Amino acid sequence: MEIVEYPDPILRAKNKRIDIFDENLKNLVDAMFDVMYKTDGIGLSAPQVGLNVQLMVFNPAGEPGEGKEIVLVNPKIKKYSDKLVPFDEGCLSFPGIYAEVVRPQSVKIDARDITGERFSISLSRLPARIFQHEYDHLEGVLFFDRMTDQVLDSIREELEALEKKYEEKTGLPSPERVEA
Ligand SMILES: CCCCC[C@H](CC(=O)NO)C(=O)N[C@H](C(=O)N1CCC[C@H]1CO)C(C)C
Ligand SMILES: [Zn+2]
Ligand SMILES: [Zn+2]
Ligand SMILES: [Zn+2]
Ligand SMILES: [Zn+2]
Ligand SMILES: [Zn+2]
């Protein structure tokens, strides 16, 4: 069973609206949470497990029997804060790579829950940091796309190692290259 790693194109592909809110959905959500707990993550998005659908799960505590198991399908940011804050992010699709990303502090979101119920929440602190990370995923935006040029530099070679890994595995050239 498998986390999709950069530079896999799955991570860049358009993700479908979810229309159907059934048990398969609940089983998917549940697989995702368990992937998160196994890999010590604090969120996951559907493309990261091979599925180009608009679905994210997160839990800010990142620990069993802690925090909240938050689910969001078909979300859309209605607004970002003006205030920006730094935070060191890693990503399960880029194993071992950690670097500063600056993002809005809070967001207003419109999203659906696991049954189909549309709602409207605000987020700040870690929940908004995780959300935005995962929402980028839903839009085929990766964390290094959001990194300043000096920060991207410090991880270039680490990204290329992932590029190489994918080339060695597939026999194909990487479909994208941080050298940009
Ligand atoms: C920070 C914003 C949300 C991060 C989400 C990722 C998981 C992921 O890639 N989701 O798309 C994660 O859990 N990353 C972890 C991460 O960045 N963490 C773990 C808790 C604190 C923070 C490191 O500052 C580790 C696994 C790299
Ligand atoms: Zn489970
Ligand atoms: Zn579980
Ligand atoms: Zn832990
Ligand atoms: Zn990620
Ligand atoms: Zn190079």
Author numbering: 1 to 180
Authors' account:
Binding of actinonin resulted in a tightening of the active site through the collective closure of the entire N-terminal portion of the protein (strands β1, β2, and β3; helix α1; and CD-loop, see Movies S1 and S2, Figure 1C, and Figure S1). The amplitude of the structural change was maximal for Pro60, the Cα of which was shifted 4 Å upon actinonin binding. Hydrogen bonding was also conserved, especially the bond between the backbone nitrogen of Ile42 (corresponding to Ile44 in EcPDF) and the alkyl carbonyl chain of actinonin, which potently contributes to the formation of the super β-sheet (see also below). Between the open and closed states, the side chains of Ile42, Phe58, and Ile130 underwent significant structural changes, corresponding to a hydophobic pocket rearrangement, with Ile42 being the most affected.
Here, we explore the precise structural inhibitory mechanism of actinonin, which is a slow, tight-binding inhibitor of peptide deformylase (PDF), a metal cation-dependent enzyme. The function of the active-site metal is to activate the reactive water molecule involved in peptide hydrolysis. Actinonin is a natural product with antibiotic activity that inhibits PDF by mimicking the structure of its natural substrates (nascent peptide chains starting with Fo-Met-Aaa, where Fo is a formyl group and Aaa is any amino acid) in their transition state.
